[PDB]
């Protein structure tokens, strides 16, 4: 609601939420460690943290220092993702 | 524990093409290739949604690759330190047994990101001796908490108990 | 002066790959919002040069611009064109800087100074929202039986014609009824497309109070949006150069915030 | 026997088929872009045409409860019918009772009769309802397009065993493709009879034996259906609203052949008045080649050619590749009905 | 002797072969995407065709008890024959009879006689059925294919011994591929309910090249002599492959097109001319797709003939186009030893070269 | 004296070599995935060929 259902990178309609930090889990969760994102940007962020050992502090999409990376990853998806594989769930 | 049983069941439900896709991704990370990422996400994400104690991404990826390569049959009570340890009773004590034992013991000095090749050679040694069953759920549970001393102690104790029979 | 801008979208290629540009056109509300994001304030641009902050409509200028979406342009490729007419200079490099995947060609903009004399023939294309306001009895339920309610609803519904009249004649009469006031007289009018335009709008809805106070917890509820669309092309003649220029840059109907009012004129 | 109809027709941009985004449908043929009209549009235009009003006895609907509550008269049957339908299994994933049912407008009275019976249990009532909708196939429009009904077992009843609910189609229609290159529209961003028409080739195939079998052996109704289908196909516009076809070719064969390869090379003309004629010429070429390269002995092929007022001929000016040329549509229909054996057009209208 | 058939055929927009998601099949060749039609689809289309109907004597069914029940008559034998097939080893496990039996033996009356014999034990009758299944070997549909069965051993009895069940197929079919870059498109549809109160499908259009290979000696051996039946099979296969199409979505995508070019060659070794289309065909304004594809095929055929020439085995081939529409050797080369404008005389010439057979008497061997 | 033969050959879509799973064999060259045909398969195909019959 706060983000007006807009992605924080491409300003597209937002459907997912990315956790900036993991200070609290489950019992307490302020709406300040979360950011609104679309499917492509969330997937790029997920693939940008697989083996970095970030632990607590994760990627903040608002930081410019990540922007040039994130878009690049997005390009790869648009070049290689197959919609017939996400459908027909295996 | 629930979360791993369903993961292994879903892995056992895969067909030849997905197994080949995972086979061609051995020795690689989760992010570089997109088909493998999509398949792993489809297999794993609902389980993580429903169950909070689901296995982490790295362990699940490693287990998926190992299952794709080796394709053992799931059976409770057939863990690695028992089959390896029952096999070690048929080798020459002077030469071959220390060579196998060192490879089995090297696992205690590696993290989850470097445990592909040693496990591969161990499972190849298993396959060379006509072994068709393995406990995947138990292996995943051990690998999840590999950074705890009692886990390693129980692992070695099970190996010794199986070997001394 | 007037500013005229053109944007291009592929809407083609491999159907098994993501196409954000083609998917962006499925909701008229999203298209309107994206086009509105092209007019930033003087303070927002200085504070955020990269468009990487949460989007708030209060930080963008409000100005009644118009736009239309055309399709089926050939040359062995598929194209969807967006034509925007405004009274302000658009900032396209600020709106699409993180969404270059959407477009298939760089945006183009140019100036426009239309000066027309009295009694001049023009070739026009424009899309209308065929709507009339009526009093409707309220029928509800329809669980095998229709139950009437005494309330009468003031509602904007679609334009209807009789069984012995074609839609083209009805639309021509409906436009010629108002053409005296706008400032032009028709010569021929033919209907090309008749259909519907759909959209969805988010709205905040309160749920629970905050234990710490100072607000609620809130959620989003989606409201449908349906419009009746009819596209016309023909020839017109200018009555007086004064009211015609007012008709341009203003719109010739309702729903002007969803690409429903725009006159495109060519000198014949 | 197989009745094959090939048509060449011009259509205006205001009477075209559009996609979800509002653009006219187009396809790729011969490596180039061509205009396209879908087969579903043609089928539904023929189904709901003026000339097919006497042969429309079929409903495809998801609101069987509403149709049932239009004959009983007694207001106390809407939930019972809905419960019976749910017992049968007409409920797909999610939603509520949104399975399309295609049957005839004559067994609805039977459904109302079973629904209005308070002396019958629900299970056997649903069984009777399924039995009623397992044989409602005596509609000429069903005999040409077929039917397919798969009831879901998610909420199916105990036994309520189903019968064969599949009808094989007797009509094959292909997507109409433009003879020439798709023409672009005029851009209004360069700003400082109303539009050109498009030529289309249409192909229809009808199986006589299948149509006869699906109508429970009826024969006059089949001839009436064939005549009405020909008239509706020749005299309808897909969306919008003489415009008679420039050329109609009717053939009677045993195996289907498509002449769509006559336009692999696009027809390009500097003058717009010489388009259609040249198109016809190309068609003749291809036909001749086929008639000399893929058939001999066994069973020959004869055909009728129709042009409005014999404006455009297809005979090579010397070859008798068409049995006869006809200048009127009614005479062509009469000859087509005559070839199948008798079937005068006047006496065949007295059938539904 | 090896008979090679090459075909060039253009198709109108349709969908003749699709996967589990409805998308038409595709492949990668020369680094670019092409349309694809599976070989099994073509083989099944030729099998269930009007031309290849008089030589159909084989059946592939997962339910052999029903046919025995029909053949027996008004008696009851479903349970007994079903159990006999259980102990024959046809994989009763997994609740499915996934074992598919290609025993042709359309005279299945023998299985009825063993089933209808109330004098033999349940094990001996399971041995006679196994012994009679593995000896059909007839019905030339298995003179072109056949790995008849491989029985299950775990769930079968320990007193039944199987004989050989391998037929050593004599037909090779390649997957049809397009000569250009495939362009798949989506059609949007609507249910359009009738009583007052978007979908997605896939289709594409391409020009395909097809290759078939037949071994004469293996075909003759599989029929235990009977050269007349082999000639009939060859002629009927040529006729069926010439004019037949897959019956997939043809009620909305009628694409009954005929091939534009046919090349028939006789040689001792198999050669495929697919490498003619490593470079995809690009359409120019002065010609069409079929002519350019035929020209590229002509170039590759001439280059292969000149490059791999051996004086100990000349190659004889015939070229067929409808009414000589598209010649093969356009520029200078007389690549084909004969040019024929009709299909029937092409079949006659093929038969005459094969054995001097005539198309009339060979049709009298129906089998 | 050493005789060296180098060949370049393109193939239609097929499956000339399979593993236990039934997938065509592959390898990693230059860091990228490539198809593979085993040397033993080539040797046995040459041995059983008609040119090596004598
Ligand atoms: Mg985004």
Q: What is the 3-state secondary structure (H, E, C) of E12-36?
A: CCECCCECCCCCECEEEECCEEEEE
Q: Is E227 in contact with E356 (CB distance < 8 Å)?
A: no
Write the CA distances from E277 to D239, E30, E42, integer angstroms.
42, 8, 21
Q: DSSP for chain F, please give it.
A: ------------S--S-B-SSSPBPEEEETTEEEE---HHHHHHHHHTSSTT--
Q: Is C243 in contact with C182 (CB distance < 8 Å)?
A: yes
Q: Which residues fall within 8 angstroms of residue A37, CB to CB, at 6 or more apart? A: A7, A8, A9, A14, A16, A17, A18, A45, A61
Considering only CA atoms, which of D198, D260, D197, D235 is closest in space to residue D332? D235
The secondary structure of D237-296, three-state, reads: CCCCCCCCCCEEEEEEECCCCCCHHHHCCCCCCCCHHHHHHHHHHHHHHHHHHHHHHCCC
The secondary structure of D75-94, three-state, reads: CCCCHHHHHHHHHHCCCCCC
Distance, first Cα to last Cα, chain B: 29
Q: Which two tokens stand for residue E33?
A: 């995407």
Q: Of all helices (H) and strands (E), which one includes residue A16?
A: strand A16-19
Buried b (16+ CB within 10 A) or exposed e, C192-226: bbbeebebeebeeeeeeeeeeeeeeeeeeeeeeee
Long-range contacts of C133-140 (CB under 8 A, 24+ apart): C133/C157
Buried b (16+ CB within 10 A) or exposed e, C253-264: bbbbbbbbbbbb
- Minimal CA separation from E291 to chain D, in Å: 10
- Minimal CA separation from E173 to chain D, in Å: 24
Rounded CA separation D67/D115 (Å): 12
Considering Cα of D249, then D252, then D258, then D261, what sign does the dihedral take?
A: negative
Rounded CA separation D269/E2 (Å): 49
Q: Of all helices (H) and strands (E), which one includes residue D104?
A: strand D101-104
Q: Is the Cβ pair F13, E29 closer than 8 Å? A: yes
Rounded CA separation E296/E279 (Å): 9
Q: What are the beta bridge partners of residue E176?
A: E37
Q: Is C1 in contact with C95 (CB distance < 8 Å)?
A: no
Q: Is the Cβ pair D289, E325 closer than 8 Å? A: yes
Q: DSSP for B25-43, please give it.
A: TTT--TTT-HHHHHHHHHH
Q: Which two tokens stand for residue F4?
A: 């060296």
Q: Which two tokens stand for residue C113?
A: 């100074």
The secondary structure of chain E, three-state, reads: CEEEEEEEEECCCECCCECCCCCECEEEECCEEEEEECHHHHHHHHHCCCHHHCCCCCCCECCHHHHHHHHHCCCCCHHHHHHHHHHHCCCCHHHCCCCCECCCCCCCHHHHHHHCCCCCCCCHHHHHHHHHHCCCCCCCHHHHCCCCCCCCCCCCCCCCCCCCCCCCCCEEECCEEECCCCCCEEECCCCCCCCCCCCCEEEECCEEEEEEEEEHHHHHHHCCCCHHHHHHHHHHHHHHHHCCCCCCCCCCCCCCCCCCEEEEEEECCCCCCHHHHCCCCCCCCCCCHHHHHHHHHHHHHHHHHHHCCCCCCCCEEEEECHHHCCCCCCCCCCCCCEEECCHHHHHHHHHHHHHCCCCCHHHHCCC
**Strand-pair category, E261-267 with E316-320:** antiparallel
CA geometry: angle at C86 spanning C80 and C91, to 5°? 75
- Distance (angstroms) between ligand 1 centre and the Cα of A41 equals 4
- Which DSSP letter does residue D188 get? S
**Strand-pair category, D302-306 with D324-326:** parallel
Q: Is B154 in contact with B80 (CB distance < 8 Å)?
A: no
Residues of F in contact with B20 (CB under 8 A): 21-23
Q: At which residue do the structure tokens 């653009």 appear?
A: D23
C126: number of Cβ within 10 Å: 21
Q: Is C3 in contact with C89 (CB distance < 8 Å)?
A: yes
Residue D60 CA neighbour count, 13 Å, CB half: 16
**Strand-pair category, D171-173 with B133-134:** unpaired
Considering only CA atoms, which of B48, B18, B4 is closest in space to residue B137? B4
Q: Which residues fall within 8 angstroms of residue C118, CB to CB, at 6 or more apart? A: C238, C239, C240, C241
- Distance (angstroms) between ligand 1 centre and the Cα of A68 equals 14
Interface test with E, best of D98, D139, D289 (most E CBs within 10 A): D289
Which residue in E204, E254, E289 is closest to D205 by CB distance?
Answer: E254
Specify burial of residue D30 (Cβ count, 10 A radius: 0-12, 13-18, 19+): buried
Chains D and A touch (3+ CB pairs under 8 A): no
Nearest CA in chain A to C56: A4
- Distance (angstroms) between ligand 1 centre and the Cα of A16 equals 10
Considering only CA atoms, which of B92, B82, B67, B76 is closest in space to residue B8? B67
Q: Which residues fall within 8 angstroms of residue F17, CB to CB, at 6 or more apart? A: F24, F25, F36, F37, F38, F41
Considering only CA atoms, which of C157, C242, C236 is closest in space to residue C196? C157
Rounded CA separation C182/C251 (Å): 10
- Distance (angstroms) between ligand 1 centre and the Cα of A44 equals 9
Write the CA distances from D94 to C61, C266, D84, integer angstroms.
43, 51, 18
Q: Is the Cβ pair D13, C83 closer than 8 Å? A: no
Q: At which residue do the structure tokens 């998917």 appear?
A: C23
Q: Is A7 annotated as a binding residue?
A: no
Rounded CA separation E139/E224 (Å): 12
Q: Which two tokens stand for residue E343?
A: 């299909």
Q: Is the Cβ pair E27, F10 closer than 8 Å? A: no
Residue C37 sits at the chain A interface (C-beta within 8 Å): yes
Rounded CA separation E270/C211 (Å): 82
Rounded CA separation E18/E249 (Å): 10
CB pairs under 8 A between C and D: 68
Write the CA distances from E60 to B48, D254, E56, E94, integer angstroms.
45, 28, 12, 20
Specify burial of residue A89 (Cβ count, 10 A radius: 0-12, 13-18, 19+): exposed
**Strand-pair category, C2-9 with C80-86:** antiparallel
- Distance (angstroms) between ligand 1 centre and the Cα of B35 equals 21
Chains E and A touch (3+ CB pairs under 8 A): yes
Phi, psi angle pair for C67, to nearest 5°? -155, 160
Q: DSSP for A23-74, please give it.
A: SS-SS---TTSEEEE-HHHHHHHHHTSTTS--TTB---TT-HHHHHHHHHHH
Q: Is E367 in contact with E347 (CB distance < 8 Å)?
A: no
Q: Coil, strand or helix: which one is C102?
A: coil
Rounded CA separation B134/C153 (Å): 71
Write the CA distances from D61 to B157, C241, D323, E321, integer angstroms.
70, 55, 44, 50
Q: Is the Cβ pair A76, B34 closer than 8 Å? A: yes
Q: What is the resolution of this structure in A?
A: 2.5
- Distance (angstroms) between ligand 1 centre and the Cα of C98 equals 9
Q: At which residue do the structure tokens 């992010």 appear?
A: B31
Q: Which residues fall within 8 angstroms of residue E40, CB to CB, at 6 or more apart? A: none
Q: Coil, strand or helix: which one is D222?
A: helix
C239: number of Cβ within 10 Å: 16
Write the CA distances from C23 to C30, C101, D118, D163, integer angstroms.
10, 12, 53, 43
**Strand-pair category, E201-203 with E176-178:** unpaired
Residue B24 sits at the chain F interface (C-beta within 8 Å): yes
Long-range contacts of E29-33 (CB under 8 A, 24+ apart): E29/E177, E29/E274, E29/E277, E29/E278, E29/F12, E29/F13, E30/E277, E30/E278, E30/E279, E30/E280, E30/F10, E32/E181, E32/E280, E33/E181, E33/E182
Rounded CA separation E96/A21 (Å): 52
Rounded CA separation C60/B155 (Å): 64
Q: Which two tokens stand for residue D20?
A: 């979800």
Residues in chain B: 165
- Which DSSP letter does residue B55 get? P
**Strand-pair category, F26-29 with A34-37:** unpaired
Specify burial of residue D253 (Cβ count, 10 A radius: 0-12, 13-18, 19+): middle
Considering only CA atoms, which of E259, E167, E30, B92 is closest in space to residue D289? E259
Which residue in D44, D260, D289 is closest to E192 by CB distance?
Answer: D44
Distance, first Cα to last Cα, chain E: 24
Q: Which two tokens stand for residue E46?
A: 């030729």
Rounded CA separation C194/C74 (Å): 22
Q: What are the beta bridge partners of residue E8?
A: E209, E261
Q: Is E20 in contact with E277 (CB distance < 8 Å)?
A: no
Q: Is E291 in contact with F31 (CB distance < 8 Å)?
A: no
Q: Which residues fall within 8 angstroms of residue E143, CB to CB, at 6 or more apart? A: E167, E170, E219, E222, E223, E230, E233
Rounded CA separation D154/D163 (Å): 18
Distance of CA E325 to the CA centre of its chain: 27
Report the neighbours of E using a cutoff of 3 or more CB pairs below 8 angstroms.
A, C, D, F
- Chain A interface, Cβ < 8 Å to C: 1-6, 8-13, 36, 40, 61-62, 64, 67, 71, 74-75, 77-79, 81-84
Interface test with D, best of C11, C23, C72, C106 (most D CBs within 10 A): C72
Q: Which residues fall within 8 angstroms of residue C96, CB to CB, at 6 or more apart? A: C102, C103, C107
- Minimal CA separation from B105 to chain A, in Å: 26
Write the CA distances from F49 to E219, F42, F43, F44, integer angstroms.
21, 10, 10, 8
Q: Is C188 in contact with D194 (CB distance < 8 Å)?
A: yes
Rounded CA separation B45/A20 (Å): 19
Rounded CA separation C176/C189 (Å): 10
Q: Is D6 in contact with E175 (CB distance < 8 Å)?
A: no
Interface test with E, best of C10, C11, C14, C15 (most E CBs within 10 A): C15
Q: Coil, strand or helix: which one is B56?
A: coil
Q: Which two tokens stand for residue E164?
A: 């050989």
Report the largest interatomic distance among the alpha carbons of chain F, rounded to a whole angstrom: 43
- Which DSSP letter does residue D31 get? T
Residues in chain A: 90
Q: Is D129 in contact with D84 (CB distance < 8 Å)?
A: yes
- Distance (angstroms) between ligand 1 centre and the Cα of A70 equals 10
Rounded CA separation C54/C39 (Å): 16
Considering only CA atoms, which of E35, B40, B35, B19 is closest in space to residue A82? B35
Q: What are the beta bridge partners of residue A18?
A: A35
Residue E20 sits at the chain A interface (C-beta within 8 Å): yes
Q: Coil, strand or helix: which one is C35?
A: helix
Q: Is E40 in contact with E175 (CB distance < 8 Å)?
A: no
- Which DSSP letter does residue B108 get? G
Considering Cα of E237, then E239, then E241, then E244, what sign does the dihedral take?
A: negative
Q: At which residue do the structure tokens 């009356």 appear?
A: E109
Q: What are the beta bridge partners of residue E212?
A: E5, E173
Rounded CA separation D314/D304 (Å): 11
Q: Is D340 in contact with D1 (CB distance < 8 Å)?
A: yes
Q: What are the beta bridge partners of residue C2?
A: C112
Phi, psi angle pair for C204, to nearest 5°? -75, 140
CA geometry: angle at B31 spanning B29 and B34, to 5°? 115
Residue C176 CA neighbour count, 13 Å, CB half: 16
- Minimal CA separation from A84 to chain E, in Å: 7
Specify burial of residue F17 (Cβ count, 10 A radius: 0-12, 13-18, 19+): middle
Give residues whose Cβ lies within 5 Å of ion ligand 1: A 7, 9-10, 38, 41
Q: Which two tokens stand for residue C169?
A: 């004649």
Phi, psi angle pair for F17, to nearest 5°? -145, 135
Instruction: Please report the residues numbered 134 through 173 in chain C whose beta carbons come closer than 8 angstroms to any beta carbon of chain D.
Output: 143-145, 166
Name the experiment that determined this structure. cryo-EM
Q: Of all helices (H) and strands (E), which one includes residue C186?
A: strand C184-205
Write the CA distances from D182 to D38, D200, E12, E13, E327, integer angstroms.
16, 11, 17, 16, 30
Rounded CA separation C156/C260 (Å): 16
Rounded CA separation C69/D22 (Å): 10
Angle between helix axes D108-115 and D122-132 (nearest 10 degrees) is 170
């Amino acid at each position: 609601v706060m983000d007006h259902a807009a992605c924080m990178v491409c300003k597209a309609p937002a459907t997912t939420v990315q956790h900036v930090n993991y200070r609290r889990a489950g019992g307490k969760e302020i709406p300040e460690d979360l950011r609104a994102l679309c499917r492509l940007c969330h997937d790029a962020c997920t693939m940008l943290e697989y083996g970095s050992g970030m632990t607590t502090n994760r990627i903040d999409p608002c930081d410019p220092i990540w922007r040039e990376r994130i878009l690049a990853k997005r390009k790869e998806i648009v070049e290689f993702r197959s919609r017939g594989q996400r459908f027909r769930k295996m | 524990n629930r979360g791993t049983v369903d993961f292994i069941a879903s892995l056992e439900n895969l067909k030849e093409g997905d197994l080949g896709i995972l086979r061609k991704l051995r020795g690689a990370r989760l992010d570089e290739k997109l088909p493998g990422f999509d398949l792993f996400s489809a297999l794993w994400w609902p389980l993580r949604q429903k169950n909070q104690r689901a296995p982490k991404r790295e362990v699940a990826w490693l287990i998926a690759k190992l299952f794709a390569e080796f394709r053992f049959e799931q059976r409770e009570g057939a863990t690695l330190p028992i089959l390896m340890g029952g096999i070690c009773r048929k080798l020459e004590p002077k030469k071959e047994l220390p060579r196998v034992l060192a490879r089995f013991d090297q696992l205690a000095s590696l993290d989850i990101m470097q445990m592909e090749e040693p496990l591969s050679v161990i499972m190849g040694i298993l396959r060379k001796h006509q072994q068709v069953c393995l406990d995947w759920v138990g292996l995943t549970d051990v690998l999840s908490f590999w950074e705890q001393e009692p886990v390693k102690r129980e692992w070695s104790d099970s190996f010794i108990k199986a070997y001394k029979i | 002066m007037i500013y005229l801008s053109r944007l291009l979208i592929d809407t083609g290629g491999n159907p098994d790959r993501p196409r954000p540009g083609r998917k962006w056109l499925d909701n008229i509300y999203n298209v309107h919002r994206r086009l509105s994001m092209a007019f930033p304030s003087g303070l927002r641009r200085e504070q955020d040069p990269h468009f990487l902050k949460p989007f708030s409509p209060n930080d963008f200028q409000k100005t009644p611009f118009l736009f239309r979406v055309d399709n089926n342009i050939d040359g062995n490729d598929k194209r969807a064109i967006i034509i925007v007419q405004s009274v302000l200079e658009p900032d396209w490099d600020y709106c699409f800087q993180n969404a270059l995947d959407f477009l298939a060609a760089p945006p183009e903009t140019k100036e426009y100074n239309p000066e027309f004399k009295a009694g001049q023939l023009l070739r026009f294309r424009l899309r209308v929202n065929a709507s009339v306001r009526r009093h409707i009895p309220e029928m509800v339920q329809q669980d095998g039986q229709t139950i009437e309610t005494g309330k009468i609803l003031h509602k904007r519904v679609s334009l209807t014609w009789d069984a012995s009249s074609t839609p083209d004649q009805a639309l021509a009469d409906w436009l010629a009824a108002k053409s005296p006031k706008l400032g032009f007289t028709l010569q021929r009018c033919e209907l090309l497309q008749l259909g519907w335009v759909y959209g969805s709008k988010p709205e905040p809805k309160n749920v629970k109070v905050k234990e710490q106070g100072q607000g609620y917890w809130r959620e989003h509820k989606y409201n449908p949006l349906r419009f009746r669309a009819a596209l016309l092309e023909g020839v017109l003649e200018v009555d007086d150069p004064k009211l015609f220029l007012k008709t341009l840059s203003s719109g010739i109907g309702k729903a002007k915030s969803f690409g429903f009012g725009l006159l495109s004129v060519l000198p014949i | 026997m197989l009745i094959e109809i090939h048509m060449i027709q011009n259509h205006s941009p205001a009477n075209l088929n559009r996609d979800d985004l509002g653009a006219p449908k187009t396809c790729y043929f011969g490596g180039v872009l061509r205009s396209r009209i879908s087969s579903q549009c043609i089928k539904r235009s023929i189904r709901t045409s003026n000339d097919f009003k006497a042969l429309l006895g079929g409903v495809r609907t998801r609101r069987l409860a509403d149709l049932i509550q239009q004959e009983a008269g007694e207001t106390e049957c809407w939930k019972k019918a809905q419960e019976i339908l749910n017992k049968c299994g007409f409920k797909n994933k999610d939603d509520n009772t949104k399975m399309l049912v295609f049957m005839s407008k004559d067994k609805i009275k039977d459904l109302a009769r079973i629904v209005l019976d308070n002396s019958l249990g629900l299970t056997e009532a649903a069984q009777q309802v399924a039995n009623v909708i397992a044989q409602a196939t005596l509609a000429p429009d069903i005999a040409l397009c077929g039917r397919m009904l798969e009831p879901n077992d998610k909420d199916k009843d105990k036994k309520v065993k189903w019968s064969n609910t599949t009808v094989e189609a007797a009509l094959q229609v292909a997507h109409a493709i433009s003879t020439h290159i798709a023409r672009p529209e005029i851009d209004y961003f360069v700003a400082a009879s109303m539009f050109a028409s498009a030529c289309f080739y249409k192909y229809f195939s009808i199986d006589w034996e299948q149509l006869v079998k699906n109508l429970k052996g009826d024969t006059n109704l089949a001839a009436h259906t064939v005549g009405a289908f020909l008239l509706a196909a020749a005299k309808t516009n897909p969306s919008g609203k003489h415009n008679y076809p420039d050329g109609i070719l009717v053939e009677f064969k045993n195996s289907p052949i498509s002449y769509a390869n006559a336009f692999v090379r696009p027809v390009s003309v500097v003058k717009e008045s010489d388009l259609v004629e040249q198109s016809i010429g190309q068609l003749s070429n291809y036909v001749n080649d086929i008639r000399l390269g893929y058939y001999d002995e066994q069973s020959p092929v004869i055909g009728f050619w129709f042009s409005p007022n014999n404006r455009y001929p297809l005979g090579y000016k010397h070859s008798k590749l068409a049995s006869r040329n006809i200048g009127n549509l009614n005479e062509l229909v009469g000859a087509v009905l005559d070839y199948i054996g008798g079937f005068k057009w006047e006496e065949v209208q007295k059938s539904k």
